[PDB]
Design an enzyme around this catalytic site. Structure first.
Site, short mmCIF file in Angstrom:
data_model
loop_
_atom_site.label_atom_id
_atom_site.label_comp_id
_atom_site.label_asym_id
_atom_site.label_seq_id
_atom_site.Cartn_x
_atom_site.Cartn_y
_atom_site.Cartn_z
N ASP A 32 37.21 35.04 67.47
CA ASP A 32 38.60 35.42 67.28
C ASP A 32 38.72 36.93 67.44
OD1 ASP A 32 37.16 35.67 64.85
OD2 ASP A 32 39.05 35.86 63.75
P1 LIG Z 1 43.15 37.42 65.95
O1 LIG Z 1 44.27 37.47 66.96
O2 LIG Z 1 42.88 36.03 65.43
O3 LIG Z 1 43.65 38.25 64.67
C1 LIG Z 1 44.25 37.52 63.56
C2 LIG Z 1 45.48 38.26 63.05
C3 LIG Z 1 45.06 39.34 62.06
C4 LIG Z 1 46.18 38.92 64.22
C5 LIG Z 1 46.46 37.28 62.41
O4 LIG Z 1 46.83 36.35 63.41
C6 LIG Z 1 47.70 37.76 61.67
O5 LIG Z 1 48.51 38.47 62.24
N1 LIG Z 1 47.85 37.36 60.42
C7 LIG Z 1 48.97 37.71 59.56
C8 LIG Z 1 49.14 39.19 59.40
C9 LIG Z 1 48.09 39.73 58.47
O6 LIG Z 1 46.96 39.29 58.50
N2 LIG Z 1 48.44 40.71 57.64
C10 LIG Z 1 47.52 41.31 56.70
C11 LIG Z 1 46.42 42.03 57.41
S1 LIG Z 1 46.22 43.77 56.95
C12 LIG Z 1 45.29 43.55 55.49
O7 LIG Z 1 45.25 42.50 54.90
C13 LIG Z 1 44.41 44.69 55.16
C14 LIG Z 1 44.01 44.60 53.75
C15 LIG Z 1 42.58 45.05 53.54
C16 LIG Z 1 42.16 46.21 54.36
C17 LIG Z 1 42.88 47.46 53.99
C18 LIG Z 1 42.20 48.70 54.48
C19 LIG Z 1 42.07 49.77 53.46
C20 LIG Z 1 40.67 50.19 53.21
C21 LIG Z 1 40.27 51.36 54.03
C22 LIG Z 1 39.68 52.45 53.23
C23 LIG Z 1 39.38 53.66 54.03
C24 LIG Z 1 37.92 53.91 54.01
C25 LIG Z 1 37.18 52.62 53.80
#
Ligand SMILES: *P(=O)(O)OCC(C)(C)[C@H](O)C(=O)NCCC(=O)NCCSC(=O)CCCCCCCCCCCCC
Ligand SMILES: CCCCCCCCCCCCCCCCCC(=O)OC[C@H](COP(=O)([O-])OCC(O)COP(=O)([O-])OC[C@@H](COC(=O)CCCCCCCCCCCCCCCCC)OC(=O)CCCCCCCCCCCCCCCCC)OC(=O)CCCCCCCCCCCCCCCCC
Ligand SMILES: CCCCCCCCCCCCCCCCCC(=O)OC[C@H](COP(=O)([O-])OCC[N+](C)(C)C)OC(=O)CCCCCCCCCCCCCCCCC
Ligand SMILES: CCCCCCCC/C=C/CCCCCCCC(=O)OC[C@H](COP(=O)(O)OCCN)OC(=O)CCCCCCC/C=C/CCCCCCCC
Ligand SMILES: CCCCCCCC/C=C\CCCCCCCC(=O)OC[C@H](COP(=O)(O)OCCN)OC(=O)CCCCCCC/C=C\CCCCCCCC
Ligand SMILES: CCCCCCCC/C=C\CCCCCCCC(=O)OC[C@H](COP(=O)(O)OCCN)OC(=O)CCCCCCC/C=C\CCCCCCCC
Ligand SMILES: CCCCCCCCCCCCCCCCCC(=O)OC[C@H](COP(=O)(O)OCCN)OC(=O)CCCCCCCCCCCCCCCCC
Ligand SMILES: CCCCCCCCCCCCCCCCCC(=O)OC[C@H](COP(=O)(O)OCCN)OC(=O)CCCCCCCCCCCCCCCCC
Lengths: 110, 103, 80, 178, 128, 67, 125, 87, 110, 55, 459
Positions: H42
């Protein structure tokens, strides 16, 4: 004079590391060079020991006298304290260089 | 999401053209057609010129031109210690007095 | 010339901290698929490494022996 | 850099770019490989947890929260590849890149110093001059009457043709010219 | 939660933190498409003229010409004397002059007073 | 000497560089030990620091308070 | 660094000596007969040796001897250990004399404080 | 300085990395197998693969270009084209 | 004449010499880096000699060889102060530069 | 950018250096160490701060 | 001075009788010969000036300017022959005639022994310059530039004529020797204040003073290459020469009337350097640099000390040479791309190496890099101003910092970076252009070797 000597050698060792690792200047990507590169490793260790004031190396005959003169003179108390803290931090960053450049496991490209 | 067929085809054609261009950039065995027109020996020839000639010129300049006007070359006077012999006048600078020696 | 890549079947996480990471992830209910691609770093000639205090004492073994020999020679010369 | 950008980034593209950037900054924080693998697996677990979401509004809200968290928690001095825009070796060789139009201004003696190369260069120039009209005609045939709505370019639809606007792409200076 | 980031003039707001990037109206998509179309038309014109084999010279940039004209020749005809312009001009073109005049006049008056009083160290001051 | 590149393997080393690194590290440590043996007063000092609280009023010229 | 700084700053500056004003008492106050310090090297000798004006203290003769020994034995730069030790010993004696002066000033100051306190108590009574 | 890259070397290294990936069976892996259609991965897996290739070759593939590298052969061609490899 | 001034000015002049050769076939060829390094090494030894002269008798001098211009009562002339600082810093700087130039011959090959 | 930044900071240092040079010429009638040391028995804050800024 | 004046009046018939393809060769060769002949005036006396006759005399201040003019003529000829290839033979001869007339008027101006003759000649220098600008300029703005230049200079200079005739009526003579030996103090009164204003304002407009300078960007930007070269190298130095000559009789009123001009010059030097920092046109950048340098010269002349006059003369000569070289470099780049925008053409370091070297040397001389005569003059002026007051050091330091900043900014923008992709008509630098740059730069370094030749009578 003493700093010219050992700082020039330290910069040369750093440049050797950079050239060996294909223009990589990140200690987060260096590692394993203690055995990967013996001569530059020992040269950098000697330079760091001289920089931090090893009791009988090149930096001992200047830095130790400088510190004694600072302690034994009519100086600013804050200036003296900052000089001592700067010496400690000198040891600290030399430790950082050695630890993240030569010790541990490799992080450079395969 | 991925290449479209047109994008992939254009990229393939451009890659072929680029590789052909680089292959043409590669040179020929005779390509740089130039127009017609011991170690100690080299060290000796270098040493005589680069060191010997300038030192000759500088010494000649200093001895006969620079040291012909006053105060051009001024040497700090030599340090004289007790119990010494001044060479110009054959003088004897005397010793210091007895020290109150400790242990 | 013409270097050959070592066989990819020899890269194993066993015996390396990547195995500990894998165990922690399994306890969490997870897995990391890139174990071996990082496990090339923890094997071979990189398996054994020196600590910081050991690194500073790189030539202390021979240096101390040479110092003892020189001290003995100086003592013997001073005596006779 | 080789792909024509679209008018906007989709939600999937946004979240994938956030995923890659967060992984890179986490790797900057977790210097060691085993620690990085552990925390990257945890990060992918978080992304999998939020992977299935029927409410696109809630998905956008989660993306915004994750972006704020990343901006707070980013490494102030992240790792950058030497050739990458923030790298220490970025644009070092831009002064060594010299073009073929500069090349063709050489003296006849300089040209004669390299006889075989300039023959192939003349062949390339003939190929360029014999195809420009076909390229421009193909470009003006396919474009809509309003004008190009994207920076994409078409391939060569025929056997004897070259893709339009190819000369500088093909003849761009080498990555390490000198 | 996490502390907020306050954008400034010399440290702008990042794109990922812009609230307008998470509230996308269908009008916004049309505007983005129009902007992309404008950029694509300009890019096509430039690429055609740039890949023309018979061109020998500089591709004139009307945007560059407009910029250099507005920065240089179109300033005065669009200048109107307003209270803001008058105050800014008076300040920035008069205040420094009188400030430096006051500073140097005071310095030289003190120097002359010392010279007349005869208690200024002027020994060895041969060159002037 | 031509050193073949390695892929995911420890690089090829040379006995010459090995022995040179060992020799210079041993030289540094020998110099440090040899110097600390001969002139140890450069680190530990040479002259005792007096304790002023043990100096007598007689030798410091302090008269009795009552007098 | 030292305990004297703590005593003077977090305490009685009146009872602690002032480094810039020391000494504040007559040199013979408490010493019935006190001998002036003896200077071995003469002004002409120090001028000829061209000692730095910071180095022309009462330990200058040993410095002159050390310089003469160093100049004569030039290639052997390890042959002046005895002269170096003599110069260092003289400097050490000078430093301990300065320390004695500081201690004398401190205890004289606190003695004066005790005397004036006793006189004030007598006046109060 | 460094030995020049070749098409065969690039292909061997990318196949090496992909066979060291644990979500891909090396037996059913070929230079033309697609990550999504016939490998079963994926978007996140593709991002991880691109990051692994970036680590392998020491250069960054931009996100706009990385999304379209859906095949080991496509990755090989992209890397060779960027690095000026023609043999 | 005392060799002091002659040797010091000679070290400076021989440092300047390879610049005069920068419009020659030696500058066009690939022997120029080694040529410059050899010149620097020779200058380093020739400057070590006056350091030996100073370490024995402590000789210091000033050399106002060429008179540039007289601005009324101010005379500006090309004068070199060869004192302890100069005669100690020159050999150290030349040694460091020699090592750096060899390291650069290795490091800047491409 | 790094080269221009170094030039800028060294040029502020040169401002200090030129201040020191001008003061020394005006108040000592010379630009050489011998006469500067002879005439300046107690050197003042303006030239010494100029030298400090240059350093 | 006739041994130099007559050869130019013979250069005129040579130009008008030469063959169509030999005009440039003849003019250049004989201009170089006249320059070599005029080098003899550098042998000056230590007590008084060289009084050839009742009409012409030479001084330690007049000699370097005359040599600069005679040396500058052939460089203008080279640049003009570069940019006037398609003109008809008659118009080429007319252009050469204008240059010759300008040189002749400048020589007679610098050698005139009387103030009224000096005024007549230094006003006569306007006509050839105006014709050159408004006739062979490229842009539409040449007409407005010529109008601005002419009317600024004339509005400055007419009260100077009135003051000169009034001084003649009052004292009996305008001969410089007479007005120097028979000079009398100028009492503090409104009449003397306005006489001082007339003379000083004429020469300040010629300098130009800050607030009276707009004609300088207008003329320098819109003039041809030869006109730009002569406007900055010599025509700007007429004001400084006049102020040095005229201030003999203006004391002690100069001690009190110099404050507004000193403040204007210092603050406008800072302002014009800052303007150079944010200029989108290369010729404008060079013109404002000229304004800053001449403001520094104004400061030196106004403070009026023997150390300031020497620095003023050295700075005038050095600025003339440097500005001519910079204008020539900008003109070469303009001939490459037919536009004066500074950011249009980049990567010229990797497109034209030796021209980049010439750019680097010119920029290094533009900022005060020791031991160049630019630095010699600037340092003398700074020291004299420090003796005058101790905040002039603050102003001079700020000016030096901004000068280095904008010089290196111009160098980096024009040379460094990556070349413009679509600009593919940058042919290799011509032998003529490289020789022009070499002839601009080498005399500067030789004068650095021998500095007392350009330090004026006060040396
Ligand atoms: P592929 O096309 O299968 O991808 C699947 C996707 C993701 C496109 C899904 O089809 C999708 O769009 N799903 C629904 C939308 C979604 O998933 N929204 C939430 C995703 S963002 C999220 O959950 C992030 C949370 C955790 C990560 C946060 C980052 C912060 C930490 C960083 C710290 C900096 C230094 C480490
Ligand atoms: C003679 C100068 C000629 C200048 C014009 C250009 C000539 C040219 O392009 O030739 C092409 C020719 C061939 O090159 P190429 O590779 O074919 O050409 C392609 C590129 O152009 C190649 O480009 P490049 O980068 O190789 O360019 C070479 C050179 C070209 O540029 C220059 O040479 C310009 C130098 C001056 C810059 C202007 C500001 C300073 C002015 C000071 C002038 C004093 C002069 C006094 C004597 C004058 C004699 C005429 O540029 C530089 O070296 C960079 C600038 C460095 C300036 C540093 C100055 C600091 C002060 C040094 C001391 C000054 C004297 C006082 C000493 C007091 C104590 C004794 O160039 C050379 O061979 C190089 C020769 C010049 C090198 C520098 C020499 C002088 C440096 C200062 C003195 C150092 C001390 C030793 C002196 C020994 C004698
Ligand atoms: C309607 C709005 C119009 C706005 C016009 C603004 C113009 C501003 C620029 C020109 C004036 C600059 C003044 C600077 C401030 C200092 C003034 C000063 O020193 O005054 C005291 C000075 C000196 O006086 P003082 O105060 O030193 O005198 C004390 C000394 N004793 C005791 C002996 C008397 O005054 C003068 O110099 C008076 C004569 C001035 C004559 C006019 C010329 C001035 C400069 C003209 C420049 C023209 C071009 C630029 C403008 C276009
Ligand atoms: C005495 C005179 C006044 C002295 C102080 C005046 C300061 C005036 C500032 C100069 C204005 C700048 C004009 C244009 C300069 C060039 C444009 C520019 O900004 O350069 C950009 C460049 C890029 O920044 P980077 O960190 O490298 O980031 C790169 C990312 N890719 O930034 C710079 O170089 C600017 C550096 C100088 C800025 C001003 C800082 C100086 C202020 C300190 C003064 C206090 C000194 C105290 C003295 C202590 C010793 C006694
Ligand atoms: C066989 C033939 C071999 C050829 C050998 C070369 C000749 C060696 C020397 C012999 C020439 C003698 C000589 O040098 O003459 C001295 C001669 C002139 O001295 P005068 O006092 O005028 O004597 C009057 C003479 N009529 O000296 C010189 O010219 C040499 C000058 C050396 C330095 C040259 C300039 C250095 C370059 C820097 C430029 C200026 C920098 C500014 C300095 C700033 C000072 C604060
Ligand atoms: C407001 C600033 C000045 C505006 C300039 C406007 C131009 C025309 C102004 C008309 C002249 C203004 C009065 C000038 C003073 C004057 O005429 O006499 C000066 C004085 C008096 O002579 P006496 O008759 O002998 O006195 C009696 C003794 N018992 O004579 C002289 O000094 C002759 C000098 C002529 C100067 C006249 C003009 C100078 C003033 C202009 C300033 C400088 C020019 C600036 C150019 C800008 C043009 C606006
Ligand atoms: C570390 C360097 C040495 C510090 C020594 C601290 C000594 C004690 C101290 O600072 O006391 C506070 C002091 C008030 O003490 P006093 O001497 O009465 O000052 C009144 C001013 N007329 O107050 C002051 O002297 C004013 C500044 C006090 C700063 C204290 C530290 C923060
Ligand atoms: C109120 C506004 C003040 C503005 C000042 C100027 C700001 C801009 C500076 C730009 C750099 C050029 C000028 C440098 C001046 C250096 C300081 C100086 O010279 O101050 C004057 C004065 C000199 O003392 P002096 O007269 O010689 O000795 C008797 C003591 N009155 O000095 C003294 O007496 C010493 C006074 C304390 C100085 C502290 C250090 C200042 C460092 C400034 C760095 C600027 C960058």
């Amino acid at each position: 004079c003493m700093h010219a000597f050992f700082k020039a050698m330290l910069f040369m060792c750093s440049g050797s590391i950079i050239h060996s690792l294909n223009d990589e200047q990140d200690i987060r990507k260096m590692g394993g060079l203690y055995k990967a590169m013996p001569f530059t490793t020992t040269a950098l260790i000697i330079g760091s020991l001289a920089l931090t004031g090893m009791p009988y190396l090149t930096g001992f005959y200047s830095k130790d006298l400088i510190i004694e003169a600072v302690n034994m003179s009519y100086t600013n108390a804050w200036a003296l304290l900052m000089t001592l803290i700067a010496t400690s931090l000198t040891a600290a960053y030399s430790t950082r260089i050695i630890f993240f450049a030569f010790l541990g496991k490799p992080r450079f490209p395969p | 999401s991925g290449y479209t067929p047109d994008e992939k085809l254009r990229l393939q054609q451009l890659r072929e053209l680029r590789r052909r261009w680089l292959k043409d950039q590669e040179l020929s065995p005779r390509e740089p057609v130039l127009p017609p027109r011991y170690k100690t020996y080299r060290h000796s020839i270098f040493a005589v010129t680069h060191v010997l000639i300038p030192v000759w010129i500088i010494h000649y300049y200093l001895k006969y031109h620079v040291t012909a006007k006053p105060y051009t070359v001024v040497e700090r006077k030599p340090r004289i210690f007790p119990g010494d012999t001044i060479l110009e006048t054959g003088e004897v600078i005397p010793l210091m007095k007895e020290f109150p020696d400790q242990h | 010339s013409k270097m050959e890549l070592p066989d990819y079947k020899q890269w194993k996480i066993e015996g390396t901290p990547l195995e500990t990471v894998q165990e922690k992830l399994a306890a969490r209910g997870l897995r990391d698929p890139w174990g071996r691609n990082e496990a090339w770093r923890y094997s071979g000639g990189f398996a054994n490494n020196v600590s910081f205090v050991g690194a500073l004492l790189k030539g202390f073994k021979w240096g101390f022996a040479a110092f003892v020999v020189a001290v003995g020679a100086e003592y013997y010369l001073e005596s006779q | 850099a080789f792909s024509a950008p679209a008018a906007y980034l989709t939600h999937q593209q946004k979240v994938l770019r956030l995923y890659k950037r967060a992984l890179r900054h986490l790797e900057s924080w977790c210097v060691h490989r085993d620690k990085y693998r552990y925390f990257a697996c945890l990060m992918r677990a978080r992304f999998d947890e939020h992977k299935n979401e029927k409410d696109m509004v809630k998905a956008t809200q989660l993306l915004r929260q994750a972006e704020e968290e990343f901006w707070y928690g980013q490494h102030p001095q992240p790792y950058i590849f030497p050739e990458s825009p923030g790298g220490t070796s970025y644009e070092r060789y831009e002064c060594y890149k010299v073009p073929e139009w500069c090349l063709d201004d050489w003296h006849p003696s300089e040209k004669a110093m390299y006889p075989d190369y300039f023959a192939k260069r003349e062949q390339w120039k003939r190929l360029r001059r014999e195809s420009w009209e076909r390229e421009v005609k193909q470009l003006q045939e396919e474009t809509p009457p309003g004008g190009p709505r994207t920076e994409a370019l078409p391939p060569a639809r025929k056997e004897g043709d070259l893709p339009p606007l190819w000369w500088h792409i093909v003849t761009r200076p080498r990555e390490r010219p000198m | 939660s996490f502390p907020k980031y306050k954008p400034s003039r010399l440290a702008t707001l990042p794109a990922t933190l812009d609230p307008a990037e998470y509230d996308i109206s269908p009008e916004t998509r049309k505007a983005q498409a129009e902007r992309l179309a404008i950029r694509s038309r300009l890019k096509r014109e430039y690429l055609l003229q740039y890949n023309d084999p018979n061109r020998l010279g500089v591709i004139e940039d009307p945007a560059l010409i407009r910029w250099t004209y507005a920065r240089s020749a179109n300033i005065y005809p669009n200048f109107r004397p307003t209270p803001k312009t008058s105050l800014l001009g008076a300040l920035f073109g008069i205040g420094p002059l009188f400030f430096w005049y006051y500073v140097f006049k005071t310095d030289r008056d003190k120097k002359e007073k010392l010279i007349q009083e005869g208690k200024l160290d002027q020994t060895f001051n041969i060159s002037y | 000497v031509h050193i073949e590149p390695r892929y995911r393997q420890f690089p090829q080393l040379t006995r010459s560089q090995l022995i040179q690194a060992e020799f210079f590290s041993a030289t540094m440590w020998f110099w440090i030990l040899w110097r600390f043996w001969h002139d140890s007063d450069a680190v530990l000092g040479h002259f005792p620091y007096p304790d002023p609280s043990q100096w007598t009023d007689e030798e410091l010229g302090i008269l009795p308070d009552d007098e | 660094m030292g305990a004297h700084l703590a005593r003077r700053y977090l305490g009685d500056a009146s009872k602690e000596p002032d480094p810039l004003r020391m000494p504040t008492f007559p040199p013979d106050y408490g010493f019935p007969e006190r001998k002036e310090r003896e200077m071995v090297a003469t002004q002409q000798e120090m001028n000829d040796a061209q000692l730095m004006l910071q180095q022309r203290d009462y330990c200058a003769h040993y410095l002159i001897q050390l310089l003469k020994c160093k100049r004569d034995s030039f290639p052997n730069f390890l042959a002046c250990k005895h002269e170096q030790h003599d110069w260092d010993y003289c400097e050490h004696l000078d430093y301990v004399k300065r320390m004695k002066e500081f201690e004398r000033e401190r205890r004289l100051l606190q003695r004066k404080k005790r005397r004036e306190q006793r006189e004030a108590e007598m006046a109060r009574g | 300085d460094a030995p020049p890259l070749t098409l065969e070397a690039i292909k061997d290294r990318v196949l090496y990395v992909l066979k060291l990936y644990d979500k891909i069976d090396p037996e059913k892996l070929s230079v033309n197998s697609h990550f999504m259609k016939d490998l079963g991965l994926d978007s996140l897996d593709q991002v991880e693969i691109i990051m692994a290739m970036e680590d392998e070759f020491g250069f960054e593939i931009p996100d706009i270009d990385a999304e379209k590298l859906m095949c080991p052969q496509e990755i090989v061609d992209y890397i060779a084209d960027k690095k000026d490899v023609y043999e | 004449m005392n060799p002091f001034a002659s040797l010091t000015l000679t070290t400076l002049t021989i440092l300047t010499i390879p610049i005069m050769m920068s419009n020659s076939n030696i500058y066009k060829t690939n022997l120029y880096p080694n040529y410059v390094k050899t010149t620097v090494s020779y200058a380093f030894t020739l400057s070590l000699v006056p350091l030996l002269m100073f370490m024995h008798t402590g000789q210091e001098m000033i050399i106002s060889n060429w008179h540039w211009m007289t601005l009324q009562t101010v005379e500006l002339s090309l004068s070199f102060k060869m004192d302890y600082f100069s005669v100690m810093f020159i050999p150290v700087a030349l040694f460091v530069t020699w090592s750096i130039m060899e390291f650069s011959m290795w490091y800047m090959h491409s | 950018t790094a080269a221009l930044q170094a030039i800028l900071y060294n040029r502020i240092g040169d401002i200090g250096f030129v201040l020191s040079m001008a003061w020394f010429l005006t108040h000592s009638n010379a630009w050489d160490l011998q006469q500067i040391f002879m005439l300046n028995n107690e050197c003042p804050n303006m030239p010494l701060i100029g030298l400090l800024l240059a350093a | 001075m006739l041994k130099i004046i007559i050869p130019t009046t013979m250069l005129l018939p040579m130009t008008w009788m030469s063959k169509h393809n030999m005009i440039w060769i003849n003019a250049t060769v004989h201009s170089l010969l006249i320059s070599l002949i005029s080098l003899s005036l550098l042998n000056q006396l230590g007590e008084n000036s060289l009084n050839f006759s009742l009409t012409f005399f030479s001084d330690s201040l007049s000699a370097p300017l005359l040599v600069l003019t005679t040396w500058l003529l052939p460089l203008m000829l080279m640049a003009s022959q570069s940019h006037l290839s398609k003109e008809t033979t008659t118009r080429k001869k007319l252009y050469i005639t204008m240059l010759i007339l300008l040189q002749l008027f400048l020589i007679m101006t610098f050698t005139a022994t009387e103030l009224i003759l000096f005024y007549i000649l230094f006003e006569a220098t306007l006509v050839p310059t105006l014709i050159i600008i408004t006739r062979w300029g490229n842009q539409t703005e040449r007409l407005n530039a010529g109008l601005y230049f002419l009317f600024y200079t004339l509005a400055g200079s007419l009260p100077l004529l009135v003051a000169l005739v009034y001084i003649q009526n009052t004292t009996g003579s305008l001969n410089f020797l007479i007005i120097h030996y028979w000079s009398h103090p100028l009492s503090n009164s409104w009449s003397n204040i306005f006489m001082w204003l007339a003379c000083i304002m004429a020469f300040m407009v010629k300098m130009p003073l800050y607030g009276l300078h707009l004609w300088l960007p207008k003329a320098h930007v819109e003039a041809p290459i030869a006109g730009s070269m002569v406007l900055a190298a010599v025509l700007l130095k007429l004001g400084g020469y006049g102020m040095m000559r005229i201030t003999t009789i203006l004391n002690p009123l100069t001690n009190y009337m110099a404050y507004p001009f000193l403040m204007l010059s210092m603050w406008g030097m800072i302002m014009t350097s800052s303007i150079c920092l944010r200029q989108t046109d290369l010729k404008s950048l060079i013109a404002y640099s000229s304004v800053s340098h001449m403001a520094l010269v104004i400061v030196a002349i106004m403070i009026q000390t023997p150390w300031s006059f020497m620095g003023a003369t050295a700075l005038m000569i050095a600025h003339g040479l440097t500005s001519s070289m910079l204008f020539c470099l900008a003109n070469t780049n303009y001939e490459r791309v037919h536009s004066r925008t500074m950011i249009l053409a980049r990567g010229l370091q990797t497109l034209l190496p030796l021209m980049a070297t010439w750019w680097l040397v010119a920029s290094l001389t533009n900022l005060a890099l020791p031991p160049s005569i630019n630095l010699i003059g600037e340092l003398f002026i700074i020291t004299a101003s420090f003796s005058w007051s101790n905040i002039t050091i603050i102003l001079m330091g700020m000016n030096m910092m901004i000068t280095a900043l904008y010089s290196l900014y111009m160098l980096i923008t024009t040379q460094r970076g990556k070349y413009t992709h679509h600009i593919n008509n940058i042919k290799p630098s011509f032998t003529r252009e490289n020789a022009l740059m070499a002839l601009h730069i080498l005399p500067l370094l030789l004068l650095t070797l021998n500095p007392k030749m350009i330090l004026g009578p006060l040396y």
